[PDB]
Amino acid sequence: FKTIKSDEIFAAAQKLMPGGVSSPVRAFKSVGGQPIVFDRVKDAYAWDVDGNRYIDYVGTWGPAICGHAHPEVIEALKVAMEKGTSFGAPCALENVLAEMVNDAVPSIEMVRFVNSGTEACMAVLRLMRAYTGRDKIIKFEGCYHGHADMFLVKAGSGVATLGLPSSPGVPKKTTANTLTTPYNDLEAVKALFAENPGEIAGVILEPIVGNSGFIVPDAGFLEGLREITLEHDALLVFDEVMTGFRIAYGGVQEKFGVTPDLTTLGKIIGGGLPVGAYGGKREIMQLVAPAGPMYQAGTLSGNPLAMTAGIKTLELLRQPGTYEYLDQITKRLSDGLLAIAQETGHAACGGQVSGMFGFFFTEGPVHNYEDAKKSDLQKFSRFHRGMLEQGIYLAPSQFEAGFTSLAHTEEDIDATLAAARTVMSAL
Amino acid sequence: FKTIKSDEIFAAAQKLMPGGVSSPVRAFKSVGGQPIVFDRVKDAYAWDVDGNRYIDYVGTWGPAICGHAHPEVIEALKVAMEKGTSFGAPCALENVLAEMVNDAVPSIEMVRFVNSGTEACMAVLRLMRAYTGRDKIIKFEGCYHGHADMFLVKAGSGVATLGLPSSPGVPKKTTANTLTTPYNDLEAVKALFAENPGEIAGVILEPIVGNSGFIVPDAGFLEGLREITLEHDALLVFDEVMTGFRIAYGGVQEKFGVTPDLTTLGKIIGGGLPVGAYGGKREIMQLVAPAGPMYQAGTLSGNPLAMTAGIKTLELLRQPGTYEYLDQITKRLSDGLLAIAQETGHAACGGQVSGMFGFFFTEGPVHNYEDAKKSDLQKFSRFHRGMLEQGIYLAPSQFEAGFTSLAHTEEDIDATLAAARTVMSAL
Numbered sequence: 083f084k085t086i087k088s089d090e091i092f093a094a095a096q097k098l099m100p101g102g103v104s105s106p107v108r109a110f111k112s113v114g115g116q117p118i119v120f121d122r123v124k125d126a127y128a129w130d131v132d133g134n135r136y137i138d139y140v141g142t143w144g145p146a147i148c149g150h151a152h153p154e155v156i157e158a159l160k161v162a163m164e165k166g167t168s169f170g171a172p173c174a175l176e177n178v179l180a181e182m183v184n185d186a187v188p189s190i191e192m193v194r195f196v197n198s199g200t201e202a203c204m205a206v207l208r209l210m211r212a213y214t215g216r217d218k219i220i221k222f223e224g225c226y227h228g229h230a231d232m233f234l235v236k237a238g239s240g241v242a243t244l245g246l247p248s249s250p251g252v253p254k255k256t257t258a259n260t261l262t263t264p265y266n267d268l269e270a271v272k273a274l275f276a277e278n279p280g281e282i283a284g285v286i287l288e289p290i291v292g293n294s295g296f297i298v299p300d301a302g303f304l305e306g307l308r309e310i311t312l313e314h315d316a317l318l319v320f321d322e323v324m325t326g327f328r329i330a331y332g333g334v335q336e337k338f339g340v341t342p343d344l345t346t347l348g349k350i351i352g353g354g355l356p357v358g359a360y361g362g363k364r365e366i367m368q369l370v371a372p373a374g375p376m377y378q379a380g381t382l383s384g385n386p387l388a389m390t391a392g393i394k395t396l397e398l399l400r401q402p403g404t405y406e407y408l409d410q411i412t413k414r415l416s417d418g419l420l421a422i423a424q425e426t427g428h429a430a431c432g433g434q435v436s437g438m439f440g441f442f443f444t445e446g447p448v449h450n451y452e453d454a455k456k457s458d459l460q461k462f463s464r465f466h467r468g469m470l471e472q473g474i475y476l477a478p479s480q481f482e483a484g485f486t487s488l489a490h491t492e493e494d495i496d497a498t499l500a501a502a503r504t505v506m507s508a509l
Numbered sequence: 510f511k512t513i514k515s516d517e518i519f520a521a522a523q524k525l526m527p528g529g530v531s532s533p534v535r536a537f538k539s540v541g542g543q544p545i546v547f548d549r550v551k552d553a554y555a556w557d558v559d560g561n562r563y564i565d566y567v568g569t570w571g572p573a574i575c576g577h578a579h580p581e582v583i584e585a586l587k588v589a590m591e592k593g594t595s596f597g598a599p600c601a602l603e604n605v606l607a608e609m610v611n612d613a614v615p616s617i618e619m620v621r622f623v624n625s626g627t628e629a630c631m632a633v634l635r636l637m638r639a640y641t642g643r644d645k646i647i648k649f650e651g652c653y654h655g656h657a658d659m660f661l662v663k664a665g666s667g668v669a670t671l672g673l674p675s676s677p678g679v680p681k682k683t684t685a686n687t688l689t690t691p692y693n694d695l696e697a698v699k700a701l702f703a704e705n706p707g708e709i710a711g712v713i714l715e716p717i718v719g720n721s722g723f724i725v726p727d728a729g730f731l732e733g734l735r736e737i738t739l740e741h742d743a744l745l746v747f748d749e750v751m752t753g754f755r756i757a758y759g760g761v762q763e764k765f766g767v768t769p770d771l772t773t774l775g776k777i778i779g780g781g782l783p784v785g786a787y788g789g790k791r792e793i794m795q796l797v798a799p800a801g802p803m804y805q806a807g808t809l810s811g812n813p814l815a816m817t818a819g820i821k822t823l824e825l826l827r828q829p830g831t832y833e834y835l836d837q838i839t840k841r842l843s844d845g846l847l848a849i850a851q852e853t854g855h856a857a858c859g860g861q862v863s864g865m866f867g868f869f870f871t872e873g874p875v876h877n878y879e880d881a882k883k884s885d886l887q888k889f890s891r892f893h894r895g896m897l898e899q900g901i902y903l904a905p906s907q908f909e910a911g912f913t914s915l916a917h918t919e920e921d922i923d924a925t926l927a928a929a930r931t932v933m934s935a936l
């Protein structure tokens with residue numbers, strides 16, 4: 083397995099950028115070895131700089147649900163760019179995507195496009211506070227909502243993967259308004275409320291965790307959170323940057339049937355380009371400039387190219403059988419990985435909901451962040467490298483959900499199982 | 510001048526999005542309240558959904574320094590996308606743009622790409638506090654450094670445009686670690702250090718402000734800042750999201766010879782696409798994950814489409830006599846505007862440094878936000894609308910700098926001045 087070119091480019095990158103990467107999660111610091119430098123991607127595949135071909139399960143961390151370089155999307159962007167990529171003034175396309183989104187997401191009645199999930203989450207951090215008049219926020223341990231200062235507390239994603247402490251550089255003053263609780267622990271939530279009466283602005287959570295591994299909410303947890311927040315006039319905010327348009331067209335809130343007050347969107351909504359969004363009840367959204375007092379701006383927000391990409395993407399997902407196919411092929415995968423784990427004598431747990439799955443090297447079951455931390459990280463490290471040499475590309479971390487796409491085929495699924503069998507037969 | 514389509518489109522927009530826009534200033538609230546919706550942009554022009562054409566001086570707020578829909582830039586993008594628009598793993602293009610930026614800007618020895626100037630400013634604040642270990646930052650009135658918590662206090666852009674005050678979802682717990690002095694008040698800065706000794710992480714500012722209208726620093730202002738911060742072992746940070754690659758290839762720091770410890774970039778570096786970056790001294794960048802404990806990530810960061818547009822935009826600026834052409838046409842436009850105001854009996858002051866200009870309806874001079882505010886915004890409002898009907902598109906606000914591009918011709922300049930004469934002969 084040669085990775086000579088990747089090694090050359092990565093080495094160079096390290097003198098130019100911190101850690102040689104543009105995002106901490108791309109670091110192979112925990113999975114052993116160095117990162118693979120991509121060259122191009124298409125459908126369910128990705129090719130590196132040394133010519134090795136891989137079946138992709140990272141899907142650029144979420145956006146590629148329709149498959150990489152989807153022809154219908156790239157032709158729409160080819161035509162689009164002829165007219166300019168950014169205007170700095172309104173454009174009809176913003177109206178089209180805005181309308182599609184209201185229709186798609188149950189809680190969204192008014193929307194505001196932004197440039198990333200991190201931007202969406204920061205904005206909503208502010209609106210949750212501006213609308214309720216309270217300063218404190220409850221976020222769960224292991225969840226991730228961008229890198230805004232206040233969210234850098236018990237964060238999942240690369241902070242988990244890399245074993246980083248909370249922060250550095252964010253004042254105690256600001257971080258003190260962040261109340262944390264273990265995921266799935268309703269009692270812990272009620273305790274924070276009745277201990278800080280009239281102080282909690284709201285609760286923000288990933289409705290289905292993807293950043294501390296794949297963790298589904300316990301029965302009654304989401305309905306319960308809906309209950310305690312209505313009771314104390316607090317806001318229920320869903321961060322659907324990762325689950326939006328993936329678990330279902332309307333996301334987890336539509337699937338599980340629980341409607342929050344505000345939800346943040348990202349990844350899939352951009353279609354491969356930088357696009358984020360936050361929206362919710364009209365009376366809350368009314369506080370955003372230029373309608374209300376809360377000022378939130380962005381130069382490239384709502385630009386034509388980005389709008390074009392999300393539009394075509396949503397139109398593809400809207401096709402019949404979309405989510406039925408994803409569930410079907412993803413179920414075969416998760417189940418298969420589990421059967422092999424057992425067959426080859428390995429403690430493992432995991433599961434899937436539509437096109438998102440997870441696989442842990444631990445007896446489990448996994449309910450929160452502390453549970454996930456019990457997986458065998460050394461086993462995982464050896465299994466990742468093994469899968470990599472067999473031509474399967476998985477996220478370099480035990481703490482990240484895995485993704486499947488409409489471009490993946492039964493064949494691709496089967497070759498992954500065949501490789502998993504081979505890799506796990508050793509370990 | 511019919512705006513029927515722009516009218517109905519914007520009317521519909523108000524029902525879907527807060528204010529009917531993606532960024533506050535696009536609503537024309539300080540200039541009458543009726544925006545025009547763009548359909549396409551090319552070279553130095555813009556076209557309406559009504560078929561009207563304008564000579565653009567907004568330039569999508571900075572990005573289009575090479576002219577809209579530049580042929581060489583979009584051809585390069587059309588080629589690039591056939592390889593996928595987002596990888597989620599390293600790519601060679603990150604290396605080349607990174608090397609280019611390290612060579613272009615003096616203070617940068619290591620960079621980290623992001624998706625917007627806002628993300629870069631969030632990151633740089635956190636890194637100034639983490640590197641120094643202090644919590645106080647000195648900002649200036651009228652400077653906009655991204656819609657962030659700690660900084661939404663006397664900010665620029667919409668803030669220093671439609672008089673947006675302090676906070677907007679940011680508590681007294683966030684906007685308290687940030688001190689504030691008037692722009693150009695070196696003595697006020699000195700006081701802040703002596704009055705808060707051993708607890709100032711650093712000073713951040715726009716080296717040339719464009720977010721409170723165009724304002725140049727006085728004689729030894731920046732030089733004072735470098736030294737004072739040097740003596741208290743505090744960091745000097747230049748937010749050159751707007752000035753970078755426009756005032757000069759290495760921005761204001763190159764232009765005026767003053768070197769910050771860090772700088773933030775944006776706008777032009779993505780050439781029309783959502784991109785940002787922050788870099789500076791190696792020893793400080795070394796704290797950024799994964800090379801360090803400070804967390805900062807981003808899903809679309811360093812994506813090939815963005816890197817392509819950035820690389821191509823920089824190649825085009827490195828060509829001979831770029832900034833020389835910019836300075837020449839802009840000085841003509843600047844000097845000509847002022848002359849016309851003087852001959853029609855209107856008080857006005859302004860100026861330009863390369864392809865960035867300012868024009869206020871007050872005799873001034875303008876040295877800070879307070880001065881900028883003594884402008885007759887009612888006259889400006891009518892001025893703007895006259896110009897608009899004369900086929901000239903200007904930033905819909907007195908507190909925003911204007912922009913020139915490499916596609917604006919001598920003739921375009923002569924046509925604007927003619928428009929300006931017909932119009933200023935009213936008011």
Ligand SMILES: Cc1ncc(COP(=O)(O)O)c(CN)c1O
Nearest residue numbers: 198199200227228323324807808
């Ligand atoms: C749940 C969640 N929210 C927010 C973010 C941050 O979004 P982005 O990376 O677009 O900045 C992420 C990114 N992995 C996420 O998964």
Ligand SMILES: *Cc1c(COP(=O)(O)O)cnc(C)c1O
Nearest residue numbers: 380381625626627654655750751
């Ligand atoms: C434009 C600008 C920003 C904001 O960047 P976005 O890309 O809109 O997030 C920050 N600082 C300055 C000085 C700016 O000009």
